[PDB]
Amino acid sequence: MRRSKAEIQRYVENAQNSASSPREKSMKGFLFARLYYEAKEYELAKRSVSSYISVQERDPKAHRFLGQLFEIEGNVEKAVGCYKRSLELNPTQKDLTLRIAELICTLNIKDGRAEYWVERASKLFPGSPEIYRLKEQLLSSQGEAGWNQLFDLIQAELFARPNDVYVNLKLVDLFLSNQRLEEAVLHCLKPERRALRTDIEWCSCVVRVFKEYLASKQGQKNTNMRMITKELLLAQCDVVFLTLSKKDVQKSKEALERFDQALLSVKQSVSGTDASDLSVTFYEMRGHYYMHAGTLLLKMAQSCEVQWKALIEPAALCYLLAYQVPKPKSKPVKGDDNGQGFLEELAFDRQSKSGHLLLTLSHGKQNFISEIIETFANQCGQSILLKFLFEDNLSMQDSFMGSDDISYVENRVPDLSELSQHDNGSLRIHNGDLQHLTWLGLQWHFLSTLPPLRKWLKQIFPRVPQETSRLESNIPESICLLDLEVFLLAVVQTSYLQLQDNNTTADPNRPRCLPLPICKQLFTDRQRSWWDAVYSLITKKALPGTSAKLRSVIQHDLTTLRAQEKHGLQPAVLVNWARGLHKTGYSLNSFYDQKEYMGRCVHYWKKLLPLLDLVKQKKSIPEPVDPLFKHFHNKDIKVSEVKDLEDEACIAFATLDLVDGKTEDAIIAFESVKNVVAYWNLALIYQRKAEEIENDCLPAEEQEEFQECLLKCKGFLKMICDEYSAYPSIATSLPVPVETVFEMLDSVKQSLGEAMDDHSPAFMENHSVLTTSAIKHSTPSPTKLTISPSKSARFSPK
Amino acid sequence: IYQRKAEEIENDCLPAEEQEEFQECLLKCKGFLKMICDEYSAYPSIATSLPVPVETVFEMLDSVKQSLGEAMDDHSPAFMENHSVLTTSAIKHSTPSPTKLTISPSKSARFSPK
Amino acid sequence: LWGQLKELEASLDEPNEYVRNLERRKAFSHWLAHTAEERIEEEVSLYGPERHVEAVFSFLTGGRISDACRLAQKSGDHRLSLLLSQMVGSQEMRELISLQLVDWNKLQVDHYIQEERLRVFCLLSGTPVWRSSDNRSINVCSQLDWKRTLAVHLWYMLPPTATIAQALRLYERAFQEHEEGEPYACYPLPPYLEDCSISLGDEPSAKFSSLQRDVCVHLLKLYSERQYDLCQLLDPSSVTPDPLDYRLSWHLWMVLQALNYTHLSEHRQGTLHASYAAQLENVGLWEWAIFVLLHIPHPHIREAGVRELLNRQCVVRESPESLAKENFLIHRLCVPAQWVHEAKAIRSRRDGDRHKEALYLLKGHQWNPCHKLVTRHLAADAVINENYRYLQSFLGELSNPEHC
C-alpha cells in the first residue's frame, strides 16, 4: 500500500508535535525524506533531508539521498556536489565515484573534471564496460590526439576482453574513419573473431567491410580477393541464420535476397572443374542457402503468412537440395588445420539438420521424397519457390535460385546410421550448446530411437569419468558422464511433453519439431544456467572470479540429478532415466560399461520404489516451487501401472546381479518375477551355461548338466511362445523380435535331438522350500583391500 | 575410477555436456596421478606400497596428457578448495540382512567387466 | 501468560497442550478486556445517546458483546442488536456479513451508509480495512490503542482456535509497511509515549527501529519466541520516561530467571544489579541494595560489591534504625557480621576514633590489625592514665590460644 501524501503529512506533524526540541524534529528529517520520496513528493523530501543535514552534517547517507533527489530533478551539478560530499564523508562508496563520472560526462564532456573522475573510477573498477564507454566519450571529443589514445584504449580492452562485440565494432569503425580499409579487413579475418559470428551486428559489419573492400579493388586479380569473397559468403550465411532466429520474416527475406545476389555474383567466377577453396566454399554455401530457404518457408508458415500445407513440399525440396550437397573432400594438408576443418564441420551441421528435417516433414510417408522431386524439381517448381520467397522482387535471371540447376536431384531418403555420423560432426560447431543437444535428442525421440548421448558427451567432455564411486557427494568436481546423460534425457523428455501439450490444437501438417533458428527455447533458464555452469567449469572457459558462483549453482541441482534427500523429481522422470540407462547399458559390449549403467539404473529404481509406495497409498508427491524438471500431470504414474514398474525394477536388480557374475542370485530373482522379460533372461542364462559346458570331450556328469540346461532353456522359451499365443500385445514388451525367440527355440530343439520330445518332467513341482528372508541387495561399503587370490573371474565377454 | 568414467563417456558423437564431463574426469585422473608422482618424488619407498610398478603410473599419466591435448596445461583450478561441507555421519557399511525378494525391474546393472 | 489457572488445576489429568493453549488464550482475552475497561467507560460516557453506534463500537472493541447488544436495543437499533446477538460462535454469520459488505460495494450502496456503521460491519466481518465504492478507506483500528487493536485481531480477525503468537504476528504485519497495503494499526508504544503525537512524517521504516516498544509486547514476544532478546525487554525505556528507573526491569529479570530464562548476558545482568542497587542506595534503602547485589552470580564480584556498599553506608553511631538495618543484613540476608564490623572499623579510622576502631577490628576477627593499633596507640595512653581494665578488655580477648 503506498501511503498517501495526507497520511505521511499527518505522521510527520504528529512526529514533530511530540518532539521536545528543534534539534529532535530535524533528527527525524531523514525518515520523513524517505517517506516523501516513496510518495514521489521530491520537494518535501529535499526540505526534510536538508533540515536533517543541518543537524547531522557528517552523515554520508543523507548527502547521498539529497544527491539522488537532485539527480531526479535533472539538477546534475547540485547532485554531483551532494555526491562529492557523501564520498568525502565515506570513501568506501566506490559506486558513487562511477556515478559522479557518468553525471559529469553527461553534463559536459569538455569539463577537465571529467578526466579526473573517469581516471579515479578506472582505478576502482579496472575493465568496467561503463568506464570504457566514458573514456571513449572523452577521447572522441579530443580529435587526433584523442584518436591515438582511443586506439590504445581499444587495444587494451580487446586484450582484456577479446570477445566483446561492441569494442570490436568500434575498432573497425575507427579504421574506416581513417580510410585504413585493409586493416579493417585484416581485423575481420582474425581467427579469434569466429566466436563473434553469433552476433548480428558483428556479422553485418564484416559483410559491409568486405563488400566495400571488394568494390574498391574491382579489376585487380589478387589471391586476397578470392579469400575475402570466401569469407563474405560465410558472413552472409551467418547474417541469414541470425536474422532467421532474432528478426521477423521480412528482414529474413531481405537477408536471404542479399545472400542470393552474393551467390549469383560468385557463380560466374566458379567453373565446375576448379577444386579451388572458393569453389568448395561456394558449393557448401549453396547447400546452406537451400537449408535457410526451407527454414524461411517454415518461418512464414509459423507467422501465419501462409498455410503449413502449401509450404511443406517446397520446404522439403529445399532441405533435399541442402542434404545432397557433397561434403568437402579433405586433403589432409599437413600444417594448417584451422580453415578446411571448419567447412567440413559446416557440411556435417547442414546434413544433420536437413536430414532430420526431411524425416520430420515426411511424417513417415514412404514415397514423399519421390512426389516432391516430380512436382518441384523442375523450372516451374523453381519459379513457384522464387515467388514464395521473394514475391515479385527478383526475376529468374537475377536470382541465384532461378539460375541454379535443381533438376539433378537423387531420390535419397536419409539413412539413420549416416545421420548419427553427421550428428557427431555437427556437435563440433555448436560446442555443446544445450538447444542444439536438446533439438537432436528430440529428433531421435520422435523416431522412437534412443539418442546416442554417450558418444556426444564423450566428444564434448573427453576428460570426465563415465561414473563416480561417490553418488552421495554433491561436490561439482565429482560430476560424471552419467549425471550429464540423465540430465539430457530429462531435458529431451520434458521438452517433448511441453511440445505435445502445446500441439493438441495444431494443424496436422505442422512439423512435430521446428528447425533450430525458428524453434522456441526447448529448456528452462534454470536448466540453461546449470548446463552453462557445468560446461564453463569443466572446459575451463569460466570468467575469472565467477567460479565460486558457478560451483554453488552446480552443487544445488546435482542433488536433484542424483536423487538425494528431498530431490523433488516426478516419478516419471526416474522411470525414464532407469529405462534409458537399462537400454543403453544392455546394448554395450563392455563389461565395465554394462556394470556402471546397470548400477546407475538400479540406483534410480531404488529411489523410485518408496515413491511407488506413496502412489499405492494414494498420497500426493511433493512438487518444488521452482523445479529443475517441470512436473507433467498427464504422466503421473497410475496405481494400475505400479505393479509393472515393481516387476521392471526387480528385472533390473536381477540383470545387475547377472552382470556382477552372481548368476545363481540372478536366476532366483528372475524366477520370482514370472514375466516374459524374466523368462527371456532365464533362457539366455541357461543357453550360455550350456555353451560353457560345450567342449568336444565331456564327462557323463557334464553331459547330464548340459542336457538339463537345454531342457530349462526350452521350457522358458516355450512359456514365452505360449504367453505370446495367448496375448500378441506381449511383442511390445519383449527385448527382441518374437522371430528371434522362435529361431532360438528351434536351435535348442535341434541340439536336444528328436529322442526327448515325449518326457516332460513336471517343470515346476519341486521348489516349494525356502520361506521369506528379505534378499538384501547390498552394494559393498568401502572395506579396505584384502587381497585373497583364488577366484579367477569365470565371465569373459564372448 | 575416473579413467573408467572417461572411457564410458568416450563414444564417437558426444553432446557438449558429455564432453565437459569427459574433460572433468580426465582432469581429476591427471590430478590424482600427479599426486602419486609428487609423493613418489618425495619418498621413493612408496614404490613398495603401490599396487602397480611406478612405470605404469607414468605411462597412464602420459596417455591422459595426450588425450587432454597441449591446450589446457596452464589452467589448474584449485583442485581441493570447494568440498568443505558435510559433517560427520558415521557411514554405516551395512551388508543387507535377508529381506524377501521384491522384484522391482528398472536398473540394468551398468557395470560390464571389459 | 505463565501464572496458575484454576481451570487447569480442576483436571486430575495432565492437561493436553491444546487445552493449555485454549485456557491461556482465554486468560489473555480477559486481560485485554480488563485493560480496555476504564477507557471504554470514558468513551461511552462521552458519546451520549445521539452517537449510540460509536458507543456500540467501543463495547465491541472490549469484547462486551452483551452490553453492545443492550445499548443497541435501548437506542432503537433492533437490527444491529439482532446481528450482535448472533456473533457468539458462528463463523457462517461472519461470512454472511462479508458477502453483504461486498454486495453493498458492488451496488454502490455503501456510500449512503454512515461510516461508523460500516466500521461496525467491517469489525463483525473480520476485515480490518474496507475500501468503499467512493474510494474512502474505513480503518477499524484507526481510533484504537495498540492493546484494543491486538484484541480486535484476537477476537474478530482470527479463528477461536488461533494462538496468542498468531494474533501477535498478525498485529505486527498490521503496522509494518508491506507491498500489499498501507499500515492500518498503531505501533505499540510505551504508555508515557502513547499520547506523544509523534507525527509519522513521510519516512516511517527508519524511525520504527529507534522507537522503544511497550514491555507487554516484549513479554508477548518472549512467550511466543523463547529466544527473544531480553536486552530490549529489560530496558527501563520500555516502561518509564526515566532511563534510571530499574525497579520493574530488575523484578522482571528475577521472575524470568525463576521461569528458566537464562539467555541474558552476564554483563547486562551486572548492569541491572548495579543500576537498581545504586537507585536503592540513593533512596536510602542501602540494606536492600545489598540484597540486590547478593543475586550477582559471580562470587568475587558479589563479595566486592557488598563490601564496597558496606564501607560507604555503614554508620559507627548506634541508632535504633542502624541496628535494625544491621539485624536485617545479618539475620535475613545472612551477611557475615565480620564484614559489617570491618566496615565500622574502616569508618572509625576515618573519624579518628581509635577506641571504636580497635573494638570493631576485634569483633571483625582482624586480630593482627587490632593488636598493631592497640600496641601503637592505645597501650601507652592506657598505662599513663592507669586505665588497666580498658587495656585488659582488648588484650584479654586477643590472649585466647586460638587468636594468639
Q: What is the dihedral of CA A134, A135, A138, A140, to 10 degrees?
A: -110
Q: What is the dihedral of CA A171, A177, A181, A182, to 10 degrees?
A: -60
Q: How many CB atoms lie within 10 A of CB C163?
A: 17
Method used to obtain the model: cryo-EM
- In chain C, residues preceding a discontinuity (C to N beyond 2.5 A) are none
Cell numbers at residue C31, please? 486481560
Q: How many CB atoms lie within 10 A of CB A94?
A: 13
Separation between Cα atoms, residue A375 and residue A354, nearest integer Å:
19
Separation between Cα atoms, residue A597 and residue A584, nearest integer Å:
7
- Cβ distance C203 to A1 less than 8 Å, yes or no, reads no
Nearest to A261 by CA among A403, A83, A453: A403
Residue A98 burial by Cβ neighbours in a 10 Å radius (0-12, 13-18, 19+): buried
Q: What is the dihedral of CA B47, B51, B53, B54, to 10 degrees?
A: -60
Question: Which chain C residues are closer than 8 Å to A8 by Cβ?
Answer: 200-202
DSSP string, A310-368: HHHHHHHHHHHHHHTSPPP-----TT-TTTHHHHHHHHHHHHHHHHHHHHHHHTT-TTH
- Cβ distance A600 to B102 less than 8 Å, yes or no, reads no
Q: How many CB atoms lie within 10 A of CB C305?
A: 21
Q: Which residues pair with B14 in a beta bridge?
A: A456
Cell numbers at residue C199, please? 507525527
Q: Helix, strand, coil shares of chain C as percentages rounded to 5?
A: 65, 0, 35
Q: What is the dihedral of CA A755, A756, A759, A763, to 10 degrees?
A: 180
* Closest CB to A44 among C177, C181, C202: C202
Separation between Cα atoms, residue A738 and residue A751, nearest integer Å:
20
Separation between Cα atoms, residue A344 and residue A286, nearest integer Å:
14
The answer to whether the CB of A678 falls within 8 A of the CB of A666 is: no
In the three-class reduction of DSSP (H, G, I as helix; E, B as strand; rest coil), residue B105 is classed as coil
- Cβ distance A17 to C197 less than 8 Å, yes or no, reads yes
Q: In this complex, does chain B touch chain A, defined as having at least 3 beta-carbon pairs under 8 Å apart?
A: yes
- Cβ distance B25 to A463 less than 8 Å, yes or no, reads yes
- Cβ distance C202 to A10 less than 8 Å, yes or no, reads no
Rounded to 5 degrees, φ, ψ at A325 are -60, 120
Rounded to 5 degrees, φ, ψ at C273 are -60, -45
> If you search the block for the grid coordinates 557374475, which residue do you land on?
A661
- What are B93-96's contacts with CB under 8 Å, separation 24+? B93/A780, B93/A781, B93/A782, B93/A783, B94/A778, B94/A781, B95/A776, B95/A778, B95/A781, B96/A774, B96/A775, B96/A776, B96/A777, B96/A778
Please report how many Cα atoms fall inside a 13 Å half-sphere around the Cα of residue A739, on the Cβ side: 1
Separation between Cα atoms, residue A339 and residue A735, nearest integer Å:
46
Partner C, chain A 45-74, Cβ-Cβ below 8 Å: 45, 48
Separation between Cα atoms, residue B111 and residue A154, nearest integer Å:
55
Q: Does B13 touch chain A (CB under 8 A)?
A: yes
The answer to whether the CB of A278 falls within 8 A of the CB of A266 is: yes
Partner B, chain A 207-246, Cβ-Cβ below 8 Å: none
The answer to whether the CB of C68 falls within 8 A of the CB of C80 is: no
Separation in Å, CA of A678 to nearest CA in chain B: 9
CA–CA distance from B39 to each of A102, B33, B43, B52, B54 (Å)?
A: 56, 10, 6, 15, 11
The residue in chain A having the minimum alpha-carbon distance to the alpha carbon of residue C192 is: A18
Instruction: Please give the angle made by the CA atoms of A497, A501 and A503, to the nearest 5 degrees.
Output: 110
Distance of CA A460 to the CA centre of its chain: 12
The answer to whether the CB of A402 falls within 8 A of the CB of A386 is: yes
Separation in Å, CA of B86 to nearest CA in chain A: 9
Separation between Cα atoms, residue A533 and residue A557, nearest integer Å:
11
Q: What's the length of chain C?
A: 404
Question: Which residues are within 8 A (CB) of B16 and not within 5 positions of it... i.e. 6 or more apart?
Answer: A427, A430, A431, A432, A433, A434, A436, A437, A456, A460, A461, A535
The answer to whether the CB of C40 falls within 8 A of the CB of C65 is: no
The answer to whether the CB of A652 falls within 8 A of the CB of B104 is: yes
Nearest to A455 by CA among A475, A474, A427, A433: A427
The amino acid at residue A555 is Q
Question: Which chain C residues are closer than 8 Å to A32 by Cβ?
Answer: 201-203
The residue in chain A having the minimum alpha-carbon distance to the alpha carbon of residue C195 is: A18
- Cβ distance A646 to B91 less than 8 Å, yes or no, reads no
Separation between Cα atoms, residue A161 and residue A417, nearest integer Å:
42
- Cβ distance C207 to A31 less than 8 Å, yes or no, reads yes
Cell numbers at residue A162, please? 577479446
The amino acid at residue C403 is H
In the three-class reduction of DSSP (H, G, I as helix; E, B as strand; rest coil), residue B110 is classed as strand
The amino acid at residue A586 is Y
Cell numbers at residue A786, please? 584384502
- Cβ distance A34 to C178 less than 8 Å, yes or no, reads no
The helix (H) or strand (E) run that includes residue C139 is strand C137-139
Separation between Cα atoms, residue A684 and residue A670, nearest integer Å:
12
Cell numbers at residue A552, please? 554453488
Separation between Cα atoms, residue A248 and residue A541, nearest integer Å:
33
Cell numbers at residue A140, please? 572522441
Q: What is the resolution of this structure in A?
A: 6.9
In the three-class reduction of DSSP (H, G, I as helix; E, B as strand; rest coil), residue C2 is classed as coil
Which residue stretches of A220-276 are H helix?
A: 223-246, 249-267
Please report how many Cα atoms fall inside a 13 Å half-sphere around the Cα of residue A229, on the Cβ side: 27
Question: Which chain B residues are closer than 8 Å to A481 by Cβ?
Answer: 5-6, 8-9, 18, 21-22, 25
Which H, E and C letters describe A682-733, residue by residue?
HHHHHHHHHHHHCCCCCCHHHHHHHHHHHHHHHHHHHHHHHHHHHCHHHHHC
Rounded to 5 degrees, φ, ψ at C200 are -65, 75
* Closest CB to A593 among B75, B102, B112: B112
DSSP string, A778-789: PPPP--------
Separation between Cα atoms, residue C8 and residue B108, nearest integer Å:
63
Question: Which chain B residues are closer than 8 Å to A441 by Cβ?
Answer: 15
Separation between Cα atoms, residue A46 and residue A64, nearest integer Å:
12
CA–CA distance from A582 to each of A646, A651, A783 (Å)?
A: 15, 10, 28
Separation between Cα atoms, residue A45 and residue A12, nearest integer Å:
12
Cell numbers at residue A331, please? 586433403
Angle between helices A571-586 and A642-659 (to 10 degrees): 40
The answer to whether the CB of A86 falls within 8 A of the CB of A67 is: yes
Question: Which residues are within 8 A (CB) of A324 and not within 5 positions of it... i.e. 6 or more apart?
Answer: A409, A410, A412
Separation between Cα atoms, residue A522 and residue C19, nearest integer Å:
56
Separation between Cα atoms, residue A416 and residue B3, nearest integer Å:
31
What Rg, from alpha-carbon coordinates, does chain A have? 36
Chains that touch C (3 or more CB pairs under 8 A): A
In the three-class reduction of DSSP (H, G, I as helix; E, B as strand; rest coil), residue C138 is classed as strand
Cell numbers at residue C316, please? 559507627
Q: Which residues pair with A595 in a beta bridge?
A: B110
The helix (H) or strand (E) run that includes residue C131 is strand C129-131
Separation between Cα atoms, residue C149 and residue C400, nearest integer Å:
75
In this structure, is the dihedral angle defined by the CA atoms of residues C15, C19, C24 and C30, taken in order, positive or negative? negative
Distance separating the N- and C-terminal Cα atoms of chain C? 61
In the three-class reduction of DSSP (H, G, I as helix; E, B as strand; rest coil), residue A526 is classed as helix
In this structure, is the dihedral angle defined by the CA atoms of residues A92, A98, A104 and A106, taken in order, positive or negative? negative
Cell numbers at residue A398, please? 537475377
* Closest CB to A13 among C181, C199, C207: C199
Question: Which residues are within 8 A (CB) of C13 and not within 5 positions of it... i.e. 6 or more apart?
Answer: none
In the three-class reduction of DSSP (H, G, I as helix; E, B as strand; rest coil), residue C130 is classed as strand
The answer to whether the CB of A203 falls within 8 A of the CB of A242 is: yes
Cell numbers at residue C265, please? 548476558
